[PDB]
Ligand binder design. Structure first.
Ligand SMILES: [K+]
Ligand SMILES: [K+]
Ligand SMILES: [Zn+2]
Ligand SMILES: [Zn+2]
Length: 382
């Protein structure tokens, strides 16, 4: 039945610290899954059983040694946390018993959903999945990530189904350093990120607008980097304005066949200022989801990355899934549509458009109209 797909697996709940003081925990995917059923959207979507990702699948993004280290349970590089548990970092836990599996499952799930959508068996999909992936590098786990699920799906679409142009939109509040590195020289896949940057003083410290690509891939990496601190914080008004000026123009000109989304909900309301400190509303992610459904024919999947407040991620999930189904979205407050974006957001957008005009046609057409609000841009084009 041609519709919106979902992936979940309770086995992912097993990836927990051996002891809480961990923003990335089991109850994240669980409460999202309960929300989907409570609203009834799980009953409207087609569910798909997932699998562990084979080691060779993982080796399309990561080094052999890395894949062995955090993928296999046989029969060192581990650390003691300030909570008593085992980790590989001061941030990112490790369960010697249940982690390798759960991380490989998180990847495998976001290859089923992906291939099913891209193959024609489904319209589009949302993967309720943990641990996140976009921070995991070639040989380095970090930011709660072990394997870049989204980068693996992408690499496999290249190799199996042989898809020619792929587009990764990453809207987790942090930069996807992993996903960038994975394709930093590949022109066939466009990676564009929307992250709190603040001149490189925010995790993971990468993602300068300056960073555009190398070799054949130069100009196929777009870093919508938000500098300025939190005065005022970035909100709905600021992101919708970024999609309208940076994302959609570039993405449309690229015209991809598959759209992949590292959909972290760290940007929403109620997040402590170290974890995000942005004012995005859950309701808003719908419009961003909807705007991307216009691309590639609607061949789009969203993978859960970050987002830590339980109330926040459920809201933005149900909003995102409703958008993916084709439900009539709630109107964004008149307050929001009329609100102009702050001077910091405008400086950011303009710096990006400045660098990337050298690489895109429509960014050479106009002078900056980034300053306008939605209604003020809707009226000025009529
Ligand atoms: K991002
Ligand atoms: K690229
Ligand atoms: Zn712990
Ligand atoms: Zn994040």
């Amino acid at each position: 039945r041609f519709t919106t797909g979902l992936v979940y697996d309770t086995l992912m709940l097993k990836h927990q610290c051996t002891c809480s003081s961990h923003p990335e925990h089991a109850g994240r995917i669980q409460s999202i899954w309960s929300r989907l059923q409570e609203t009834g959207l799980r009953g409207k979507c087609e569910c798909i059983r997932g699998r562990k990702a084979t080691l060779e699948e993982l080796q399309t993004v990561h080094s052999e040694a890395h894949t062995l280290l955090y993928g296999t349970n046989p029969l060192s590089v581990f650390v003691r946390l300030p909570c008593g548990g085992v980790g590989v970092d001061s941030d990112t836990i490790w369960n010697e018993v249940h982690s390798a599996g759960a991380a490989r499952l998180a990847v495998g799930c976001v290859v089923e959903l992906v291939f099913k959508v891209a193959t024609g068996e489904l319209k589009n999909g949302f993967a309720v999945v943990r641990p996140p992936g976009h921070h995991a590098e070639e040989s380095t786990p970090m930011g709660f990530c072990y394997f870049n699920s989204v980068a693996v799906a992408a690499k496999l679409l290249q190799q199996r189904l042989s898809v020619s142009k792929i587009l990764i939109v990453d809207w987790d509040v942090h930069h996807g350093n992993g996903t960038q590195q994975a394709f930093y020289s590949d022109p066939s896949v466009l990676y564009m990120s929307l992250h709190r940057y603040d001149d490189g003083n925010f995790f993971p410290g990468s993602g300068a607008p300056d960073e555009v690509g190398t070799g054949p891939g130069v100009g196929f990496n777009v870093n919508m980097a938000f500098t300025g601190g939190l005065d005022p914080p970035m909100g709905d008004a600021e992101y919708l304005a970024a999609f309208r000026t940076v994302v959609m123009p570039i993405a449309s000109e690229f015209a991809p066949d598959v759209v992949l989304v590292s959909s972290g909900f760290d940007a929403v309301e109620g997040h402590p200022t170290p974890l995000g400190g942005y004012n995005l509303s859950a309701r808003c992610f719908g419009y961003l989801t909807k705007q991307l459904m216009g691309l590639a024919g609607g061949r789009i999947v969203l993978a859960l990355e970050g987002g830590y407040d339980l109330t926040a991620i459920c809201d933005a999930s149900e909003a995102c899934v409703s958008a993916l189904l084709g439900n009539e979205l709630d109107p964004l407050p008149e307050k929001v549509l009329q609100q102009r974006p702050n001077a910091n957001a405008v400086r950011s957008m303009e710096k990006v458009m400045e660098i990337h005009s050298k690489y895109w046609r429509c960014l050479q057409r106009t002078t900056s109209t980034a300053g306008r609000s939605l209604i003020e841009a809707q009226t000025c084009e009529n």
